Design a protein around this ligand. Structure first.
Ligand code: CLA
Ligand code: CLA
Ligand code: CLA
Ligand code: CLA
Ligand code: CLA
Ligand code: CLA
Ligand SMILES: CC(C)=CCC/C(C)=C/CC/C(C)=C\CC/C(C)=C/CC/C(C)=C/CC/C(C)=C\CC/C(C)=C\CC/C(C)=C/CC/C(C)=C/CC1=CC(=O)C(C)=C(C)C1=O
Ligand SMILES: CCCCCCCCCCCCCCCC(=O)OC[C@H](CO[C@@H]1O[C@H](CS(=O)(=O)O)[C@@H](O)[C@H](O)[C@H]1O)OC(=O)CCCCCCCCCCCCCCC
Ligand SMILES: CC1=C(/C=C/C(C)=C/C=C/C(C)=C/C=C/C=C(C)/C=C/C=C(C)/C=C/C2=C(C)CCCC2(C)C)C(C)(C)CCC1
Ligand SMILES: CC1=C(/C=C/C(C)=C/C=C/C(C)=C/C=C/C=C(C)/C=C/C=C(C)/C=C/C2=C(C)CCCC2(C)C)C(C)(C)CCC1
Ligand SMILES: CC1=C(\C=C/C(C)=C/C=C/C(C)=C/C=C/C=C(C)/C=C/C=C(C)/C=C/C2=C(C)CCCC2(C)C)C(C)(C)CCC1
Lengths: 36, 504, 134, 60, 64, 38, 60, 502
């Protein structure tokens, strides 16, 4: 079965690197909420 | 704090690090242009500039440095073909090499203003808050850009201290670098004349000079300073991206239709070469110049270069190619090997007949064969129950004139079906769909991908212009409205709407 | 210009030089022209980096043990060619009796135990001969 | 199509999530109630329009 | 407040911050210069649409 | 020539439920565009 | 800080009870010299090995 | 707070979520075993179990569910070649499927104990701090494992309520599923007899029963409870990891050398089939049994199956293959097509001579050809200046007996070089290195990758046993030592070290 040879690189960085951007920004808020 | 979409508003107050937050952005774009063009030099194939030229290899950035006078690339290969080479510092790498170190020297200066702010320059003397004058600074930004266009007009494009831009002939054959003369008349206003682009930045630069020489000396009026809110830093941010997406519409336009600043040898044909058949008006002209001149078809169709035959192909027209058929044009066809001539179709009677078909916004044109006035004489029968115009009953022959496979006729109607579809795509071409893994369906050139990526982005910069244009006029109301205001909104506020200084 | 490195060979192996019509002796005008035979690059021991020569040296494969005898570059045969070459004369002194003048050699390129076909090279320089006699 | 031609719509059989489907039931059953038990085997079920009606009468 | 050698040459450049001409300013001098620009852009748009076709222009190829 | 401390830099406040919207939005764009990258 | 993070008197008689009590290192400034001696005087024999290999005075 | 490597120490105090923090780990391993084996069923090629069997396809988990009695694959292709009918529920698509839904039902129970803790079970009645009894609970963990081994011994491997394990013949040909009898004598202690593995978990299960029936009733002594620190959770964990490492050494061993619990048809040959030439002792035996019947060797070497020839290949021995030559064994050779017989080398005189070469820890063995006693008669000359034993001066012929290319001799010495290297790898085999993109250099089987991944991990679990064994004995001193202690360490002071009474 034919494939574009590079979409699995492309659609694993398309899903991760904005979501771990988003997953970075939720933890910081939790620390701030704690007041630590 | 603040939400994630208003992160950069920390820099909106103090302009100490606002220089620094452009300067890593400026290091990121300069550290793209070297970082992409060095990759773009890693896949070139300079062995055949006539058969697979440099826009065939899907190459976005090496027309744009190439179309100002650079050629040599420390490999013995030059696009021009001009010899006696010895590049030195300005080759392809050397521009692309320089943008790495410049972006490194941009990034080291980008980290300097982040740690050092309040350098006695960003505040007024009236109080110590950080605030910078914008209209006095516009007179000193534009006077530098007025000097630099006047440098770019006369001192680079006209041979005084620099090589000229790219200029070709029409039907682009002998396109090389020579300094163009700035033509001042009305003839420089059509964009196919390159003499206007030299006369551009002299004349626009001299009024760019006389703008900024004027703009330093005067002050804006207070009926504009409170109106356009010129003390605010975001009022430069709206109405400069208005002047960017206005500026991005024209190179969405003038790349797509074509100009002298977008020639054929480094961008491809420009999609309107099939809607009139522009290149097919020439190779048909030269054989009828050679035809009646004193030369037969077969022997003629040979002083045509293969470069003219390569521009009369559907597979170099930039219409075809899709959004997600990704890669160079050589992933669509492979490497162009040879012309193998021009097909001429004859019946059992003569009655010469031709194929001039496949316009651009189709994908699968059904093959028709017609005569001079337009009555169909042959086609490919989709249902062979009631055929009356098929190939086999008519007995069409192929005369393949000129090229690689000159003089080889085909009378078997199983093989005429292959060259009929090849005649749909202008002139056929030999390929090799195994060296690069080319599949067989079309791609688009760098002229196609530019205008997609400069008109979709110019749509997006229109929305930021509405958004930043709202927030400048509506700065005070932006965190919500004052509470009631029921007397301003109810009807009977003498007479003009929204007036407190009235009967109300 | 084109980023190959072809290994040129200036060989003089058995020139048998013809010459135009009847000369008393060379007059700083006459044309010497024939060919030699050229030798190879691999002189029966130049291994590639997977020890791949004909003349001894580990026939046709080392490490891919199951895709072993399928590759195509292991016929390593030598040749005894003939071509074109010209050599002129221009200076031709009298007492020390050394004659010199231009040359034009047209050779074959490398065949690195027979990968590629040859290229063609017009090598042109002065001859620097010296003549004496009985 | 109701003749023979088994049209694939499952992600194991080479098709994308845009091109995948539950690929509805056959023309030969018509408007018959075709459950999993009036099939003689589940290979007879899934070749002849089985799991479409399971995600229609349960879904509705 | 960090006085540098750069800052002693650009503080007279950014000296005035809100200093603004009263009266009317140069808005009629701005309007008579830039209504000509909109009709300049009206020339350029249909030179290229070939709708004010002069002689010896021929907005097309066979150019130089 | 000498460093100081910023009177600036408000932090960011991405909520718990706003993580769910952003995580879902990337994953519907994941299941939309991954066919087109193939 | 001026106070130590660890006591050398407890680390002494641990190693004094692991091996010979006489063969430990009681004082830390004599300890750290031997820490700075043993690879440092070692490796310029190996550096002088290749430097005496350089004149083809080889291993036996 | 705490550093990143001591994150899980929040669960060390309260055992309310300690059930929950295994239970998503248990859902992750059960949600691997279904999630891998469903992928492992997506690439099988069941068209030829004799030529490319299931360990040839680089398949880690489908021996392990397969070697207990499950062959119904749902497509009707039985693993053993005798898939009688619809398998029923227990096929690979099924067992794989269950481990998905079980791990889903494990994960939904994993989220339950995280939100609900202090369920009146984790504290003592003496005060309200969370603390659980470990040795009374060891008597009720092991009594369940003692019941479950005794179930696994008699009620699964012996045909009473279940199908038996995999058992083959030696020189594995007719390996299928049949219930094995538990042999109780000394014959069940050699691991090649499968009658011990049925007699294993009956006898180990009954003493697992009589352990846990004893272990509930008694209490540990206080000379051990303060010694082994049995009130602490960490000590138990250390003991468990240490025990596990011991258990991972044996299946690093008994997979690699081979046993009846690791047969050939679902793991490959076991690397000691070349160091004695185990399979080459059989195909050589059967043709000399065939000429003892009195048959000619052209139409002998044909009642040999190709399965015996496939086990006499270097490219199925699990020694070859590297650490980063990644993929199945079919990326190394391609698909096995046909045997093409056995080479027999003759000179111009006869003088029969053979190739039996290429041991396992080589990569490029130089081709030698020798006679019965060991004097070399032919080789491949690396330097043809002073050759005296080359192929061309000797004039060696090839007799290719049996197989696909039977009876086809080769007298041209350019083609003898190909079959001499093929004779180095036991018997040759036809392939196709274009359908899977196979390059041509060797890979290793699932028997090779198991023992690499179960002895390297067992090294790593030894370090955790030292590390957790330190922290149980040394809990009090773990955040640093009390300040001076100079009288405890200075000598001669009375009397024995660590005593405060001199
Ligand atoms: C010249 C370009 C330009 C500049 C300098 C700004 C500057 C600003 N915008 Mg703005 N904007 C622009 C164009 C621009 N805009 C355009 C073209 C649009 C239309 C799409 C918008 C729409 C917009 C909105 C709707 C908002 C802003 C806001 C803001 C402010 C804060 C930005 C922030 O924190 O985002 C930080 C951004 C992120 C943390 C990540 C966003 C995710 C994006 C999609 C990733 C970008 C992809 C890639 C990295 C970029 C490559 C594309 C590039 C080549 C064009 C800041 C003053 C905000 C505001 O009002 O504050 C005053 C706000 O709400 N902008
Ligand atoms: C506008 C600038 C520009 C232009 C026209 C192109 C054009 C091209 N590049 Mg290029 N490139 C660019 C920027 C650009 N690039 C940048 C910035 C980089 C660095 C990351 C690269 C890196 C790059 C490489 C490494 C290569 C190319 C190649 C190519 C050529 C092949 C065609 C292709 O890949 O299209 C493909 C285009 C698409 C698939 C369209 C993408 C559409 C996006 C994903 C839509 C995004 C939607 C968004 C997610 C939704 C928003 C969310 C909403 C909620 C708001 C083509 C000429 C290739 C080539 O020929 O080089 C030899 C190649 O190998 N490019
Ligand atoms: C839907 C379109 C739209 C909207 C709502 C806005 C909204 C706004 N713009 Mg704006 N703008 C737009 C399009 C738009 N723009 C376009 C297309 C451009 C050209 C790139 C600009 C360029 C621009 C600048 C340069 C500035 C604004 C500014 C502003 C703000 C103040 C209002 C103002 O002066 O308007 C401007 C009025 C117009 C754009 C209307 C133009 C109508 C012309 C004069 C009629 C010409 C008709 C003519 C006979 C036909 C010729 C064409 C023919 C060949 C077809 C406001 C936020 C100002 C700002 O940022 O606020 C501080 C500002 O300085 N705009
Ligand atoms: C039965 C297995 C087991 C269990 C349950 C524990 C449990 C524990 N160990 Mg431990 N350990 C083990 C085996 C085990 N260990 C082994 C085998 C070693 C040797 C390598 C160690 C070495 C070790 C050290 C050196 C330390 C612990 C510590 C700890 C405690 C906290 C762990 C933590 O926060 O790390 C959280 C881990 C991370 C945030 C990420 C670590 C990055 C790893 C490499 C990623 C793992 C890769 C992958 C996901 C796992 C797949 C492999 C798996 C199949 C085996 C906890 C009580 C710490 C302690 O003393 O606290 C009391 C401590 O300092 N352990
Ligand atoms: C111990 C368990 C085990 C076993 C023996 C194997 C073995 C195998 N798998 Mg498999 N696999 C496993 C676990 C395992 N897998 C897990 C947990 C997953 C899920 C992620 C997979 C997913 C998987 C897929 C998807 C596929 C395989 C395939 C294969 C086969 C091909 C060989 C291979 O890939 O080796 C390659 C092995 C290596 C390259 C070695 C890796 C070494 C690591 C990176 C070293 C790590 C060092 C570390 C970073 C340093 C620590 C830092 C320090 C500071 C402490 C082979 C039989 C393939 C196959 O044949 O299936 C059809 C295949 O397609 N596996
Ligand atoms: C370098 C090796 C090493 C070290 C330092 C430790 C250290 C420790 N182990 Mg340990 N252990 C080891 C290897 C090691 N172990 C091995 C290989 C095993 C078998 C898997 C175990 C199994 C084990 C258990 C089950 C327990 C410990 C425990 C402990 C701790 C308390 C001390 C104790 O009782 O020792 C144990 C003593 C030994 C391991 C020495 C064994 C020496 C034997 C008896 C001699 C046999 C010689 C024999 C004649 C030759 C037969 C072999 C022959 C065929 C070659 C301590 C942290 C305890 C713990 O966790 O603390 C709470 C505990 O309960 N260990
Ligand atoms: C049969 C039965 C039941 C018998 C038991 C009963 C019975 C009768 C017993 C009697 C038998 C008996 C006692 C012994 C017989 C067995 C026997 C002879 C065993 C000996 C075997 C043997 C070869 C031992 C020698 C090996 C050994 C233990 C050590 C080697 C020592 C050596 C040469 C070098 C060690 C290297 C060295 C000097 C290290 C120190 C340098 C260093 C950097 C230290 C760091 C350091 C030091 C400090 O000082 C402090 C402070 C700090 C901070 C610190 O960093
Ligand atoms: C959109 C247009 C915005 C309004 C234009 C504007 O700013 O007008 C300000 C002036 C009026 O100032 C005139 O001149 C005087 C200017 S001043 O006092 O000297 O500044 C002023 O006092 C007087 O009231 C006023 O009539 O507008 C004009 O009438 C002059 C422009 C005439 C040419 C139009 C083109
Ligand atoms: C330090 C220094 C240096 C260095 C420097 C460097 C090295 C730099 C780099 C630079 C670079 C390295 C650059 C580059 C960059 C890149 C970039 C920046 C990119 C980006 C991208 C993007 C932006 C994209 C986007 C997108 C996507 C994602 C896809 C498609 C579409 C779009 C477009 C959207 C030196 C030594 C010299 C000197 C000294 C200093
Ligand atoms: C909700 C639910 C459900 C579902 C479930 C699921 C779906 C699950 C999943 C599961 C899964 C999905 C599982 C799987 C998993 C996987 C894993 C867990 C993996 C891991 C991996 C690893 C661990 C690896 C590691 C490594 C690497 C990285 C490489 C190699 C080496 C090593 C080994 C180191 C249902 C509906 C049914 C029911 C209801 C409930
Ligand atoms: C200077 C500085 C700063 C800033 C920083 C930042 C924040 C930066 C950012 C940066 C960035 C933001 C960067 C980015 C870049 C880009 C990148 C890194 C990317 C790349 C990518 C790519 C390349 C992609 C993709 C791909 C691949 C790989 C495969 C397929 C194909 C493609 C091409 C698609 C400040 C002032 C604060 C201070 C300090 C320093």
């Amino acid at each position: 079965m034919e494939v574009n040879d590079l979409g699995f690189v492309a659609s694993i960085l398309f899903v991760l690197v904005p979501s771990v951007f988003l997953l970075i920004l939720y933890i910081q808020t939790q620390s701030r909420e704690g007041k630590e | 704090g603040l939400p994630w979409y208003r992160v950069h508003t920390v820099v909106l107050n103090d302009p100490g690090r606002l220089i620094s937050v452009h300067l890593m952005h400026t290091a990121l774009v300069a550290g793209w242009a070297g970082s992409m063009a060095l990759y773009e030099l890693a896949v070139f194939d300079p062995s055949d500039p006539v058969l697979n030229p440099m826009w065939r290899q899907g190459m976005f950035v090496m027309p744009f440095m190439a179309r100002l006078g650079v050629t040599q690339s420390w490999g013995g290969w030059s696009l021009t073909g001009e010899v006696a080479d010895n590049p030195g510092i300005w080759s392809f790498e050397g521009v692309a090499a320089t943008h790495i170190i410049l972006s490194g020297l941009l990034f080291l200066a980008a980290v300097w203003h982040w740690v050092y702010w309040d350098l006695e320059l960003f505040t007024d003397p009236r109080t110590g808050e950080p605030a910078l004058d914008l209209p006095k600074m516009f007179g000193i930004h534009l006077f530098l850009s007025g000097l630099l266009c006047f440098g770019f007009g006369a001192f680079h494009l006209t041979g005084l201290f620099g090589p000229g831009m790219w200029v070709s002939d029409p039907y682009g054959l002998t396109g090389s670098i020579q300094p163009v003369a700035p033509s001042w008349g009305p003839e420089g206003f059509n964009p196919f004349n390159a003499g206007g682009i030299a006369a551009h930045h002299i004349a626009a630069g001299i009024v760019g000079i006389i703008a900024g020489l004027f703009h330093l000396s005067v002050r804006p009026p207070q009926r504009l300073y409170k109106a356009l809110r010129m003390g605010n830093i975001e009022t430069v941010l709206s109405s400069s991206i208005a002047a960017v997406f206005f500026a991005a519409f024209v190179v969405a336009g003038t790349m797509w239709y074509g100009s002298a600043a977008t020639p054929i040898e480094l961008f491809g044909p420009t999609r309107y070469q099939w809607d009139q058949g522009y290149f097919q008006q020439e190779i048909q002209r030269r054989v009828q110049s050679s035809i009646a001149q004193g030369d037969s078809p077969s022997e003629a169709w040979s002083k045509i270069p293969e470069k003219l035959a390569f521009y009369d192909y559907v597979g170099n027209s930039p219409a075809k190619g899709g959004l997600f058929r990704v890669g160079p044009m050589n992933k669509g066809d492979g490497i162009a090997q040879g012309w193998l001539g021009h097909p001429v179709f004859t019946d059992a009677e003569g009655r010469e007949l031709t194929v001039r078909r496949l316009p651009n916004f189709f994908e699968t044109f059904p093959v028709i064969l017609t005569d001079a006035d337009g009555v169909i004489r042959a086609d490919i029968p989709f249902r062979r129950a009631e055929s009356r115009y098929s190939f086999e009953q008519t007995g069409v022959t192929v005369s393949l004139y000129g090229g690689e496979l000159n003089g080889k006729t085909f009378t078997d109607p199983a093989s005429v079906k292959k060259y009929a579809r090849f005649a749909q795509q202008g002139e056929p071409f030999a390929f090799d769909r195994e060296t690069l893994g080319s599949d067989g369906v079309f791609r688009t050139s760098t002229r196609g991908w530019f205008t997609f990526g400069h008109a979709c982005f110019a749509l997006l910069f229109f929305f930021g212009h509405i958004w930043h244009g709202s927030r400048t006029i509506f700065r005070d109301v932006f965190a919500g409205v004052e509470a009631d205001l029921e007397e301003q909104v109810e009807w009977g506020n003498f007479q003009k709407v929204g007036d407190q200084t009235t009967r109300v | 210009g084109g980023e190959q490195v072809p290994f040129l060979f200036t060989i003089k192996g058995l020139v048998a030089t013809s010459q135009p019509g009847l000369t008393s002796i060379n007059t700083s005008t006459d044309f010497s022209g024939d060919f030699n035979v050229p030798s190879y690059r691999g002189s029966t021991f130049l291994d590639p980096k997977a020890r791949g020569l004909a003349s001894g040296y580990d026939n046709a494969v080392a490490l891919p043990a199951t895709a072993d005898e399928e590759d195509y570059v292991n016929a390593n045969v030598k040749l005894a060619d003939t071509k074109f070459k010209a050599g002129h004369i221009s200076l031709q002194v009298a007492k020390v009796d050394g004659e010199t003048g231009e040359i034009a050699g047209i050779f074959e390129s490398e065949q690195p135990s027979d990968n590629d076909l040859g290229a063609k090279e017009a090598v042109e320089v002065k001859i620097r001969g010296a003549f004496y006699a009985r | 199509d109701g003749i023979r031609e088994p049209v694939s719509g499952s992600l194991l059989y080479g098709n994308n999530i845009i091109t995948a489907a539950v690929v509805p039931s056959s023309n030969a059953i018509g408007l018959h109630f075709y459950p999993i038990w009036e099939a003689a085997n589940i290979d007879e079920w899934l070749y002849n329009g089985g799991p479409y009606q399971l995600i229609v009468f349960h879904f509705l | 407040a960090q006085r540098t050698w750069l800052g002693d040459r650009l503080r007279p450049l950014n000296s005035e911050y809100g200093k603004v001409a009263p009266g009317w300013g140069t808005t009629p001098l701005m309007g008579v210069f830039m209504g000509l620009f909109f009709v300049f852009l009206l020339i350029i748009l249909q030179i290229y649409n070939s709708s004010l076709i002069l002689e010896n222009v021929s907005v097309d190829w066979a150019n130089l | 020539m000498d460093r100081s401390r910023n009177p600036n830099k408000q932090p960011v406040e991405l909520n718990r439920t706003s993580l769910y919207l952003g995580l879902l939005l990337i994953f519907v764009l994941g299941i939309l565009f991954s066919s087109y990258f193939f | 800080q001026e106070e130590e993070t660890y006591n050398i008197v407890a680390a002494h008689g641990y190693f004094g009870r692991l091996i010979f009590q006489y063969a430990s290192f009681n004082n830390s400034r004599a300890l750290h010299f031997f820490l700075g001696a043993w690879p440092v005087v070692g490796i310029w024999f190996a550096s002088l090995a290749v430097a005496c290999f350089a004149f083809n005075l080889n291993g036996f």
